[PDB]
Design a protein around this ligand. Structure first.
Ligand SMILES: Nc1ncnc2c1ncn2[C@@H]1O[C@H](COP(=O)(O)OP(=O)(O)O)[C@@H](O)[C@H]1O
Lengths: 125, 89
DNA sequence: CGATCGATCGATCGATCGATCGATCGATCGATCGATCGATCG
DNA sequence: CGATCGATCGATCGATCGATCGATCGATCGATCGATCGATCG
């Protein structure tokens, strides 16, 4: 059953004018890490992430404004690099609450809206 | 939930007493720790000698427990009943 | 005409102390059950 | 002579509460960044 669903994760749904997400809960000795290592090494441009190894601006691209051309620029992010791919998150429980909070919009609407001083825009992830 | 019109009874607390008395007798309710029918004559003697607090405290403050749990009510109560929608919490 | 430190004040993050809360150990009286017994009359 | 009853005391179930502790959510003081410009220098 683990094999089928994770395979079904790679097949994916069908976007129309689609992504499938999976959580592995189990005792800390059973094959959890090995499958995720395989997935990002078998999918194009996957990103390997962990709880304390990332931040709120780790998955979210750091949007800033240019100092000379004054345009809006983005410096990439984990959830932006893997657009259309699969992102592997280890220790998903130990994710910080702030970092965990921004998942809701990403997982359901596939967007990251940011409202800060001088910048008001939304991304696609 | 019934909209007001531009220009159901809440029965009085005294009238509800008869309804409460009816339900207490039909064993839908029961007193908090009601032993009920004693087993032997000596137990009945000691029970009739004693005066329980539940029989002394006012009619409005006697503690009761329920025999038909709300889930059983939702099983039994017809859905055509007006109050059926409240068989859920 | 261009390159390098400086001071300021808004904006953002975060880490640290603290406010808030579920749990257990110790206690106890409210409610009750039965035994004791002194009192009453056939 | 004994048979009936109303009161009292000891004991126990249980429903409850206070003192104490570590754990969860949050306010907020401190660190850093940034943006334009200015003073010294070539
Ligand atoms: N069903 C299994 N099939 C193959 N290997 C397994 C299985 N269950 C446990 N293992 C072994 O146990 C080890 C567990 O490591 P891993 O799953 O990577 O991290 P964790 O110890 O946190 O689960 C792996 O090296 C793996 O070889």
């Amino acid at each position: 059953d683990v094999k089928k669903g994770i395979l079904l994760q790679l097949f994916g749904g069908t976007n129309k004018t689609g992504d499938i997400n999976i959580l592995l809960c189990g005792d800390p000795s059973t094959s959890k890490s090995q499958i995720l290592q395989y997935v990002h090494k078998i999918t194009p441009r996957g990103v390997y992430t962990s709880g304390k190894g990332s931040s709120a601006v780790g998955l979210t691209a750091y949007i800033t404004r240019d100092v000379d051309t004054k345009q809006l620029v983005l410096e990439s992010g984990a959830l932006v690099l893997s657009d259309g791919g699969v992102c592997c998150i280890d220790e998903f429980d130990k994710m910080s609450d702030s970092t965990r909070s921004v998942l809701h919009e990403v997982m359901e609407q596939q967007t990251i809206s940011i409202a800060k001083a001088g910048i008001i825009t939304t991304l696609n992830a | 939930r019934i909209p007001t019109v531009a220009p159901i009874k809440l029965w009085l607390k005294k009238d509800v007493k008869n309804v409460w008395e009816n339900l207490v007798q039909l064993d839908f309710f029961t007193e908090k720790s009601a032993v009920g029918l004693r087993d032997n004559a000596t137990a009945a003697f000691y029970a009739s000698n004693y005066q329980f607090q539940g029989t002394m405290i006012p009619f409005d403050l006697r503690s009761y427990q329920m025999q038909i749990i709300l889930q059983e009510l939702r099983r039994i109560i017809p859905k055509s009943n007006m109050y059926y929608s409240w068989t859920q919490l």
